[PDB]
Amino acid sequence: MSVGFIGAGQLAFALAKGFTAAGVLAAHKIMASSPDMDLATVSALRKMGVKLTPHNKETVQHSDVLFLAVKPHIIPFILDEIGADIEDRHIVVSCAAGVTISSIEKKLSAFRPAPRVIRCMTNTPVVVREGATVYATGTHAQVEDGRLMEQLLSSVGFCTEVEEDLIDAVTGLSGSGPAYAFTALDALADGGVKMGLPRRLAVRLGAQALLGAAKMLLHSEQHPGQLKDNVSSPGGATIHALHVLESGGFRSLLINAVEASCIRTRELQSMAD
Amino acid sequence: LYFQSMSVGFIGAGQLAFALAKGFTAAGVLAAHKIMASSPDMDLATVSALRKMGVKLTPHNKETVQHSDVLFLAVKPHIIPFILDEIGADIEDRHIVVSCAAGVTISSIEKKLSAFRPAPRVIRCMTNTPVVVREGATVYATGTHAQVEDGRLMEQLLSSVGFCTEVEEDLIDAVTGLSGSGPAYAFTALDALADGGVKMGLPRRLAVRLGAQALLGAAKMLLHSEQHPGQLKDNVSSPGGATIHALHVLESGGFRSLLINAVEASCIRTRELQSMAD
Amino acid sequence: QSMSVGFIGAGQLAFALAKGFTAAGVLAAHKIMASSPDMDLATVSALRKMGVKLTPHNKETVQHSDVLFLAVKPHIIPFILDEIGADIEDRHIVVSCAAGVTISSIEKKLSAFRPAPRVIRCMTNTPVVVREGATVYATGTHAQVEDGRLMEQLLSSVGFCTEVEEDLIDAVTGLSGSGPAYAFTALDALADGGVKMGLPRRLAVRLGAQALLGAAKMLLHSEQHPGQLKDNVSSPGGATIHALHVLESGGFRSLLINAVEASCIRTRELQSMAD
Amino acid sequence: MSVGFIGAGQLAFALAKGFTAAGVLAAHKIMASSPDMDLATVSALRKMGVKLTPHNKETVQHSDVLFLAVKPHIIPFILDEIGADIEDRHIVVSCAAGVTISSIEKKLSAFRPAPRVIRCMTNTPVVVREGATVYATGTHAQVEDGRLMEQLLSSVGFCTEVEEDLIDAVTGLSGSGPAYAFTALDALADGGVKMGLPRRLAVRLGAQALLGAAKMLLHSEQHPGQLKDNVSSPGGATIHALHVLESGGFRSLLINAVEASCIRTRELQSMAD
Amino acid sequence: MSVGFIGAGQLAFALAKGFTAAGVLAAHKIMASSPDMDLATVSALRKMGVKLTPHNKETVQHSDVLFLAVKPHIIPFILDEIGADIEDRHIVVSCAAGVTISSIEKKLSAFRPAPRVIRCMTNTPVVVREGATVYATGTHAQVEDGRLMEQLLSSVGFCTEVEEDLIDAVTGLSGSGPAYAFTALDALADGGVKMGLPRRLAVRLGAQALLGAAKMLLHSEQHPGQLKDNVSSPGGATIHALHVLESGGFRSLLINAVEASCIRTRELQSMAD
Ligand SMILES: O=C(O)CCc1nccs1
Ligand SMILES: O=C(O)CCc1nccs1
Ligand SMILES: O=C(O)CCc1nccs1
Ligand SMILES: O=C(O)CCc1nccs1
Ligand SMILES: O=C(O)CCc1nccs1
């Protein structure tokens, strides 16, 4: 099976790297296109052995599964350019935030009546095969298309099917989530440096703390509040730190973040539903 | 590497003793029957879980000492001096005493134990609960009389359950504020992120899973990257997009400063927990 | 049984305990004596109507009693101990209810008169008046083995009761001793919220109080974490999660932590005698 | 009399558990339907003796009193599915937040002209028979229908009839109220842990303090401010703690919460009135 | 003339790079010592051609002007180790924050009576020859020693003599100042990205804006408030942005920062004055 990426940015690189590292795809069975071959993401794809072309039509012609890994406002232009090149064999997988299946189908149906469309929301940790991916299947997607998508994206992280109307909320949580974590890790490392740790050790310890806690929750049947309770001895260091987080409304900031990203995603839709 | 078939004891049968015993046995580096733990309270859920693993339990701290080669002190800091007075006369040349208590200095432990035998082998460590899934973060410092192999043995043992490295002892209070308390900051964050997912229409179970996977993957990316966390953050955010809108609202609440406050507060409290004279 | 109980002090807590004990059927009111320097208090008039014996003389209360509750303010305790110390007999169990006042300080004062006073320290709260109190106690140096068991049987008749190490009692004061006032504040505000949204005040008070009672009962009867029970209330996108967000934005959780901390710290400052 | 639940989520389970514990209904006279009852409630309902079915039409056929215990946006789908199966004997009891009687009657009247509809707002503590429930009777409810509703729901807590236009406000107060209490208890327990208490004891004491204070107010003729005044000695621990609550605007946060839940409830209405 | 660095960290690298780029020193006339030759700063010094040694005594023996480029708490250990190796020819230049001339002289005078000591406070932009440096001369510094110091440090930026009691305040302003600017530039770039700019363009524009404004002030006789007034048209974009800075107390945060760094510097003194 052949996979193509229209777009050669961060997400295209991340998925190609994860897929090849998972061994589910050989790099030479992957083609990516970009109007700008000066991006550092483009240089990395070449070293992997991925085929690169400036022409989106070559990617379509090479590919069976076609990832649209461009910005939401770029999607309509891509569909207009390649719509006449879509064949019965194609599964079109849109990764753009906010852009609906119905808007993609409407554009592509002007060329051929039953395009097979899947919408996904994934995130950059697919590059280390620890992504979080959801997908929704379109009107003309065959039942085996969703199954194929799930097999492919499970090789690079968690993957599950969702109703499409949950995907904007997923974007606010796991799509944007890694950036909340990178911010948190930078700040935790600054806190370690303030208290006397070298910066490189502080970054390592903070990231290991967050990785281990996340793994504990994924493997636990217990509520995150119970795991939190297990860390704190009474009167101790951890509960003193949890108080100062609470006094700043830490929980509310993270709710604000998921909400803000989800609401912005709804504003990003570029085409008519 | 180092060949073991050695006995491990825990004075204390609470969360950390359970976490370390579970991690060590899951790593395959220790058999559960080579582990003994003592506790004044055999009603704890950690005590019942240790029994099912096959760990030996006893109310008598002296039995744990007599059973053990490596002796973890996994009790609260203010309990450490009482333990040392109780079992100091039972410490033998073979023993490596590993204190896990926050804030308690090597010198205070050596001073207490040297009243009984002159050159106690003492290691201080700071570890955290994710050793239970073999993804702990551990640092250690070796005491005055630690033998040449004692630090290497400690590092081999604790590396089987996560990251482990030697540090100067005067960094351990700061490590406590960062990776010792750190999992609780993450559990708080994951609860709140899941609440945000629920507010925006996700089922709670899905929201918890996605948020935890997002944090796990981001942490793995940074551990495997040569890039600054700010550069990885820049890579997530498309211009004008959803992520940068969310990052602004985090900044407006002083999110970064809250996490600095937390590391600072835990570290400062740790300095107050020292129970004995250095 | 034969047990005679005395209260030195006839204020809110003496009334609440006497009312709870008599409603529980564990004490007849005529087996209770209370003393107060001020028989104008409404608590004193209520005790009289219950059938409790009242006297201005703390010494009469001591002579009447087997179990002697010191239900006066912390700074009043040393004065009581000096006044009645010579009247303490071997049969007496002295139960101090005052916030912050340590067993050792009471024993030191009383041992000047007789060498092995039987002292218990307790921290209880006003809901003993409806037999839903929260009480902890710690036993002193000379408490007999049966003294703690007797006090737990007595105080369990009016709510939750358990033994604790004495060094936890200041923290308990900040949590369940002061806790009912945090709840009364919360219920007044929740009722104001109901009124703002159009409910009659009497209905709003009833619904808010029933909501808090039912939630607390659920947690007491559940093996689940309070966070899981919270998750069970909130449907995705729904009314409850929108309200929880506005609580979080104001730092609601931190205010309640601040309150427990402030009450506990103040309790440590109230100790009036040398330990 | 037979009772049915369309919906097998948290609220249906709580009502079924409460009713069976009250002894007012035998569990085998209760049927519940859900297309996916994957919560442990299936084992608990079975252990209770509740009949389970995936087909909402079977629940209607079994039932005299029919509780609609699904999400507000699901109500119209349920009414479309079962509307032709409603008989003269049925009392339809909607539990969904925000959904008006008139909207339900309009949907059901496309099938039969005088549906007997009750709207209720209850809460999860019915599971321990300490719920807070209000109800309003619809246009065609017989006078005995309201009496039956009140007898049934009083067996599991407080119950009173209200004008329908109060129910959104009730939702903000006693519907959402238990979650405010669970948050408060988690935080109060954190405060106990900070000051040196073991977590399990702190949770027990905080919950008992809340329970007892609420019972005092329910049995008192006094204002809650007077009961608050009775707790505080002058200069003492309690008044110091109340000051720090006031300094954070504690009262205003709870007012904000009731308002926010009530306003959101008004937005949840899914059908035309 | 020979220059030595005890310490091979960020500041030693920055000064060596600036000095060699200024052409005032050949890299082979510079020696640096460090107990840790695994630092990335150590690797860069080797490529420049700077001599490296693990032994601080070799640096002293090689050098005439000796920079102590170690942490404040490390200073006393260095002085004890090399005190007996100081010769009449040596000028000892301490770069450590907070550590006083008198404390250094007292340590070194146990070995030889009149050590020539200079205290300086410089910053990392010496690496691009745009540093800000102040210095104070010690008790036994010859008048030509201060002149030499000023000639050397002026080749890599601004340099002026100050009374020693101003140096902690200078540390809070220009010593720590570059970090305030790096923070500000990261945030300004995030603001550009929020409004639709690519990140690399936003970083470039923000840094050019700050560079140009700083150059304008250095070349102007006008107050910074007058230059600020010249940017804003009435009712325009800039004055709207200045309002939101003012509403957040922007000015006060920067005063807080200088103050906090200065106060911490006073706490860093490791030796008795
Ligand atoms: O909160 C505390 O005081 C315990 C901190 C830790 N002690 C040992 C590992 S983490
Ligand atoms: O910040 C944005 O708008 C991109 C969000 C994502 N798009 C695709 C995966 S995550
Ligand atoms: O949070 C929501 O939207 C559900 C509110 C309630 N619905 C029924 C009982 S309480
Ligand atoms: O507010 C105070 O200082 C009294 C606290 C309590 N004392 C006894 C029960 S509750
Ligand atoms: O403050 C304004 O509205 C003027 C902004 C600028 N106009 C031209 C260059 S900078």
CSV table of N, CA, C and O and ligand atoms in Angstrom, one decimal, chain A residues 11 95 97 121-122 171 175 268, chain B residues 236-238 241-243, ligand 2:
chain,number,residue,atom,x,y,z
A,11,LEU,N,3.6,18.0,10.9
A,11,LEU,CA,2.8,16.8,11.1
A,11,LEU,C,3.1,15.7,10.1
A,11,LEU,O,3.2,14.5,10.4
A,95,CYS,N,-6.2,16.0,8.0
A,95,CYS,CA,-5.6,16.2,9.3
A,95,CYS,C,-5.9,17.6,9.8
A,95,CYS,O,-5.4,18.0,10.9
A,97,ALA,N,-7.2,21.0,11.4
A,97,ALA,CA,-8.1,21.3,12.5
A,97,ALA,C,-9.3,22.0,12.0
A,97,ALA,O,-9.3,22.8,11.1
A,121,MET,N,-7.6,13.7,13.9
A,121,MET,CA,-6.9,14.7,14.7
A,121,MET,C,-5.9,13.9,15.4
A,121,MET,O,-6.2,13.0,16.2
A,122,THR,N,-4.6,14.2,15.2
A,122,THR,CA,-3.5,13.5,15.8
A,122,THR,C,-2.6,14.6,16.4
A,122,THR,O,-2.9,15.7,16.4
A,171,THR,N,-9.2,18.2,19.7
A,171,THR,CA,-8.1,19.1,19.3
A,171,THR,C,-7.6,20.0,20.5
A,171,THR,O,-6.4,20.2,20.7
A,175,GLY,N,-4.7,17.4,20.8
A,175,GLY,CA,-4.0,18.0,19.6
A,175,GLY,C,-3.1,19.1,20.1
A,175,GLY,O,-1.9,19.1,19.8
A,268,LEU,N,-11.8,28.0,12.8
A,268,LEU,CA,-10.9,27.7,11.6
A,268,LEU,C,-11.6,27.1,10.4
A,268,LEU,O,-10.9,27.1,9.3
B,236,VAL,N,4.3,22.9,17.6
B,236,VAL,CA,2.9,22.4,17.7
B,236,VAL,C,2.0,23.5,17.1
B,236,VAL,O,0.9,23.2,16.6
B,237,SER,N,2.4,24.8,17.2
B,237,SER,CA,1.5,25.9,17.1
B,237,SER,C,1.5,26.4,15.6
B,237,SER,O,2.5,27.1,15.2
B,238,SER,N,0.5,26.2,14.9
B,238,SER,CA,0.4,26.9,13.6
B,238,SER,C,0.0,28.4,13.9
B,238,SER,O,-0.7,28.7,14.8
B,241,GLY,N,-3.5,29.8,15.1
B,241,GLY,CA,-4.3,28.5,15.3
B,241,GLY,C,-4.8,28.3,16.7
B,241,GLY,O,-4.7,29.1,17.6
B,242,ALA,N,-5.3,27.0,16.8
B,242,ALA,CA,-5.9,26.7,18.1
B,242,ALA,C,-4.9,26.6,19.3
B,242,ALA,O,-5.2,27.1,20.3
B,243,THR,N,-3.7,26.1,19.0
B,243,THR,CA,-2.8,25.9,20.1
B,243,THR,C,-2.3,27.2,20.7
B,243,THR,O,-2.2,27.4,21.9
F,2,LIG,O1,-2.7,24.9,16.5
F,2,LIG,C1,-3.4,24.5,15.5
F,2,LIG,O2,-4.3,25.2,14.9
F,2,LIG,C2,-3.1,23.1,15.0
F,2,LIG,C3,-3.8,22.1,15.9
F,2,LIG,C4,-3.5,20.7,15.3
F,2,LIG,N1,-3.7,20.4,14.0
F,2,LIG,C5,-3.4,19.1,13.7
F,2,LIG,C6,-2.9,18.3,14.7
F,2,LIG,S1,-2.9,19.4,16.1
